[PDB]
Amino acid sequence: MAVQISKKRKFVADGIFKAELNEFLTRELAEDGYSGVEVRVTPTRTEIIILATRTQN
Amino acid sequence: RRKQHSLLKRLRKAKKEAPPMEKPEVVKTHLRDMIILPEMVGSMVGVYNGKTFNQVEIKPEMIGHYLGEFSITYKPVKHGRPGIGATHSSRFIP
Amino acid sequence: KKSYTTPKKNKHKRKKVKLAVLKYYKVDENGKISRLRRECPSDECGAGVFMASHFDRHYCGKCCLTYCFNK
Amino acid sequence: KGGKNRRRGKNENESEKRELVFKEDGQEYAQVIKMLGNGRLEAMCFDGVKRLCHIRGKLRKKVWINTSDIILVGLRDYQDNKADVILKYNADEARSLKAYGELPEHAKI
Amino acid sequence: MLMPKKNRIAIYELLFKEGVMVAKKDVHMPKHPELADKNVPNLHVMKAMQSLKSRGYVKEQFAWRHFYWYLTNEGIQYLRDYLHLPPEIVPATLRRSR
Amino acid sequence: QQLYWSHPRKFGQGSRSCRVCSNRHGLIRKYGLNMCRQCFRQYAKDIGFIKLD
RNA sequence: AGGAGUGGAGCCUGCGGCUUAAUUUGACCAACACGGGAAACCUCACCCGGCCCGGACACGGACAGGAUUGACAGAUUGAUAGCUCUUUCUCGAUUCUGUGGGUGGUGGUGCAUGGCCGUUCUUAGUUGGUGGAGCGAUUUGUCUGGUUAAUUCCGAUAACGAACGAGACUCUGGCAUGCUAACUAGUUACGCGACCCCCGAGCGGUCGGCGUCCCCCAACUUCUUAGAGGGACAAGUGGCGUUCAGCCACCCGAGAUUGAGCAAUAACAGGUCUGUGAUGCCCUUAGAUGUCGGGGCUGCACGCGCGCUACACUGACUGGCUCAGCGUGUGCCUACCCUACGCCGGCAGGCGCGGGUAACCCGUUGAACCCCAUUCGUGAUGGGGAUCGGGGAUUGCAAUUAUUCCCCAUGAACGAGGAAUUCCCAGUAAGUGCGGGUCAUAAGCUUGCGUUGAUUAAGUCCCUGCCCUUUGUACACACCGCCCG
């Protein structure tokens, strides 16, 4: 579980995760009124807040 | 030896079985790469170009060189008669 | 890009001949089982399969790169 | 032409080369004799009979048929004197056909 | 074959346990790491899911060189009888999401 | 079946592949790209960059 | 007005033509060192051989003495492809076979399309509402005049009140001994002890000078770093203007322009189906347009474009001195980084050790032109380094049509360039080196950065072109128009 990548490369890999997800979801939640995401890593946990208008579907 | 094995056995073999004072038939190759060596001499080898197996006799004077230098892979070139647009003049018709 | 031009051979896959099956065990009296040629000796072979009686060549078909006696 | 413009609104092009009907029944090779105007033109057939050739749609201002040279001509089903142009060839194509021995070996380019 | 009979089970059983499969688009994968452990040397996941998908029983997304196969109710019934499993077992998931 | 299907790809322009679909021709490596210049543009808005100059 | 060139010469590279079994292909101001396109293989679409199915699913057929799977050797074969044949074991319902139906394609169509980009167009342009004027197409608003870089303002006024572009905005440069705070940044101060030379007063110590180690629980933040703030507004003065909007000069000083990013309405049969698992239709789909091996995109009597190196003395050559910046770097893709130090070699290079996730290690980036001293002497010369022979290294699975690098030898055109033509106004042109990009090996390319640093202008509509008004028109596919004998 280590070490860890360069600080320059740290942001690029985050951007790739932020972007890939945002097109993954758009191809499944299109009919459910998708509107975006907002990611947050939190202490020992990931949060992926899946914004859509109708949480029902 | 990265399976040049296939060539070097056929050469010695065919050289052996062939009548005295006569050369063998041919061993063919798509491999244009392999150093010409003293042991290879006296054999006759056809070498693939793009379609054609150009046959060559191996001399003791060719040692060190590659196989592919003795078989060409293009027509030397002829010309020509310059064509139409072959310059700042070709144009117009109607 | 353009369409294929005529060949003068092509043949795909051999039909892997339609031989009669199991005559490899010979019965002349019971409970005796008259085996012919030796059953395959490798650890990874089960030794319930027969070896080829292929004389001037002696080869396990379960093996596919190894164990080729020839005499 | 010598470049210019307005010559791209419309479908460049060209002859990606290509190949090769004949003759058929009443549909054969001729040579340009003259070069009238208005539109029509003259062309003696390769058999021996003369005829007067006529241009065909599309080929109108899409292909220039300078004087002298082989050209593919349909014959009218009933008319002798007037005949109908088809499908021209290339000068290279015409000398390949001549070398093959399918059209008569009489005319030079 | 098309593929062995061992390697069928190892895909169909693994799907039943997670409730979902994912894989990559390649044909030079050597043993398929990233589960099914070291016994799929070729397509096999993609090739078997596609045949399953033809007959319904699963849905399929694809995005940035990665498949995503979502098992469905009809396939659960099929796979349950096909693998001789209890009349009520789903080990993939079963709880209410809060 | 066959005893071959492949031949050494270990370096060169064929042993790396770009993430459009496994597209090429458009040689790319930069700062950990592996990302195609046509789509890089479409991800100007997406995160990694916002244009400022 | 001038500065430096191109066109001339040699070489690199792209394009046409020609050749070829194939020499794949798009593109003709707004193509042509462009498609990140510097192709050994791969790439790869092309050409020639060989193999494979990765033809789902459905229905029918075959079928457990069984559907079916694979392979040694020999022969064959570029081949160690059971590909084929000889030979005879092996696999076991996954299949095979027929029909229906799919699937793949750098296949075609950019004149079926989406998206993106370029261009008209770097100029100042653009539109609706309500009212007014016309039978209507339309027009007024959007202007005679002054003014501005700008449809920018002032003013006029059958229009009034608004919107988009311009500007405003964002980034960058230039001004802080003010503010904020720093052993992953420095300076100063000693404490110093150590080295060094008396080099200067003195004696060598000390005082002074030179850097390094020592530095702290020292002091500070000027230099370096990056944050919060302030500063420039035509502000003040003198002219000029309707004295309005503004313009010119000057003080202070950083002068109202340091350079970029963003950019309207409407349009083009512009480019791109070879970026796209974006996409219509058509084609092809087992003798495949979907995989391995070999060849080609580099082939030349010729034409053109972008550039590089040169024609010497304001130079070349050999020594000596001395200055920089933007960056980048292994732990990533699948096997790979940047290098100090020690040792060996003329060199390319080899070998042994160590550091670096990086204001921490490479690197106080100890770079070039320039600077200082020898040698050559107006000579196609020692200028120029093309062509070409032999030899040595490195990368790789492979280096031949020479991958790249090094050593010796060979020593061409070329002695300032026709008709024509490009680009440029201040740290700008020109000279000169460096980093990044592509990269297993390799920039004469492109993109950024420093260093040295001029001459000429402060204008004009002559040429080329663009904006606004007025006028004329047989034009509206719009003068690259139309039309006569």
Swiss-Prot record, chain A:
Residues the record lists as Phosphoserine modifications: 6, 35
Record's comment on post-translational modification: Methylation by PRMT1 is required for import into the nucleolus and for ribosome assembly. Sumoylation by SUMO1 enhances protein stability through increased resistance to proteolysis.
GO biological process, one term: translation
Modified residues (N-acetylalanine): 2
Subcellular location: Cytoplasm; Nucleus; Nucleus, Nucleolus; Mitochondrion inner membrane
Annotated keywords: Acetylation, Apoptosis, Cell cycle, Cell division, Cytoplasm, Cytoskeleton, DNA damage, DNA repair, DNA-binding, Isopeptide bond, Lyase, Membrane, Methylation, Mitochondrion, Mitochondrion inner membrane, Mitosis, Nucleus, Phosphoprotein, Ribonucleoprotein, Ribosomal protein, RNA-binding, Transcription, Transcription regulation, Translation regulation, Ubl conjugation
Top-level taxon in the UniProt lineage: Eukaryota
Gene Ontology molecular function: class I DNA-(apurinic or apyrimidinic site) endonuclease activity; DNA binding; RNA binding; structural constituent of ribosome
Keyword Protease recorded: no
Keyword Mitochondrion: yes
Subunit structure: Component of the 40S small ribosomal subunit. Identified in a IGF2BP1-dependent mRNP granule complex containing untranslated mRNAs. Interacts with HNRPD. Interacts with PRMT1; the interaction methylates RPS3. Interacts with SUMO1; the interaction sumoylates RPS3. Interacts with UBC9. Interacts with CDK1; the interaction phosphorylates RPS3. Interacts with PRKCD; the interaction phosphorylates RPS3. Interacts with PKB/AKT; the interaction phosphorylates RPS3.
Curated annotation (Swiss-Prot), chain B:
Subcellular location(s) of the protein: Cytoplasm
A GO biological-process term: ribosomal small subunit assembly
Cross-link for Glycyl lysine isopeptide (Lys-Gly) (interchain with G-Cter in SUMO2), residue positions: 59
GO-annotated cellular components: cytosolic ribosome; cytosolic small ribosomal subunit
Entry keyword set: Acetylation, Cytoplasm, Isopeptide bond, Ribonucleoprotein, Ribosomal protein, Ubl conjugation
Keyword Ribonucleoprotein found: yes
GO terms assigned for molecular function: MDM2/MDM4 family protein binding; RNA binding; structural constituent of ribosome; ubiquitin ligase inhibitor activity
Subunit details: Component of the small ribosomal subunit.
Primary role: Component of the small ribosomal subunit. The ribosome is a large ribonucleoprotein complex responsible for the synthesis of proteins in the cell.
Family of this protein: Belongs to the universal ribosomal protein uS19 family.
Protein name: Small ribosomal subunit protein uS19
Lineage: Eukaryota, Metazoa, Chordata, Craniata, Vertebrata
Shown part of the complete sequence: 50 to 143 of 145
UniProtKB/Swiss-Prot annotation, chain E:
Domain of life: Eukaryota
Keyword Manganese: no
GO MF, one annotated term: structural constituent of ribosome
PTM annotation: Methylated by PRMT5. Methylation is necessary for its interaction with NPS1, its localization in the granular component (GC) region of the nucleolus, for the proper assembly of ribosomes, protein synthesis and optimal cell proliferation. Monoubiquitinated by ZNF598 when a ribosome has stalled during translation of poly(A) sequences, leading to preclude synthesis of a long poly-lysine tail and initiate the ribosome quality control (RQC) pathway to degrade the potentially detrimental aberrant nascent polypeptide. Deubiquitinated by OTUD3 and USP21, antagonizing ZNF598 activity. Deubiquitinated by OTUD1, antagonizing ZNF598 activity and stimulating formation of polysomes: deubiquitination by OTUD1 promotes stability and translation of a subset mRNAs with a high abundance of rare codons can limit the translation rate.
Gene Ontology cellular-component annotations: cytosolic ribosome; cytosolic small ribosomal subunit; nucleolus
UniProt keyword terms in alphabetical order: Cytoplasm, Isopeptide bond, Methylation, Nucleus, Phosphoprotein, Ribonucleoprotein, Ribosomal protein, Ubl conjugation
Modified residues annotated as Phosphotyrosine in this record: 12
Annotated localization: Cytoplasm; Nucleus, Nucleolus
Keyword Ribosomal protein in record: yes
Quaternary state and interactors: Component of the small ribosomal subunit. The methylated form interacts with NPM1.
Family membership noted in the UniProt record: Belongs to the eukaryotic ribosomal protein eS10 family.
Gene that produces this protein: RPS10
Entire protein: shown range: 1 to 98 of 165
Swiss-Prot record, chain F:
UniProt-listed InterPro entries: Ribosomal_uS14, Ribosomal_uS14_CS, RIbosomal_uS14_euk_arc, Ribosomal_uS14_sf
GO molecular function annotation: structural constituent of ribosome; zinc ion binding
Assembly description: Component of the 40S small ribosomal subunit.
Protein's GO biological process: cytoplasmic translation
UniProt keywords, alphabetically: Acetylation, Cytoplasm, Endoplasmic reticulum, Metal-binding, Methylation, Phosphoprotein, Ribonucleoprotein, Ribosomal protein, Zinc
GO cellular component, one term: cytosolic ribosome
Annotated localization: Cytoplasm, Cytosol; Cytoplasm; Rough endoplasmic reticulum
PTM-bearing positions, type N6-acetyllysine: 45
Function: Component of the small ribosomal subunit. The ribosome is a large ribonucleoprotein complex responsible for the synthesis of proteins in the cell.
Keyword DNA-binding belongs to the record: no
Cofactor note: Binds 1 zinc ion per subunit.
Source organism superkingdom: Eukaryota
UniProt modified residues of type Omega-N-methylarginine: 9
PANTHER family xref list: 40S RIBOSOMAL PROTEIN S29, SMALL RIBOSOMAL SUBUNIT PROTEIN US14
Residues annotated for Zn(2+) binding in this entry: 18, 21, 36, 39
Cofactor: Zn(2+)
Species: Oryctolagus cuniculus
Similarity comment text for this entry: Belongs to the universal ribosomal protein uS14 family.
Protein name: Small ribosomal subunit protein uS14
Claim: Disulfide bond is one of the keywords in the record: no
Modified residues annotated as Phosphoserine in this record: 6
Coiled coil, from the record: none
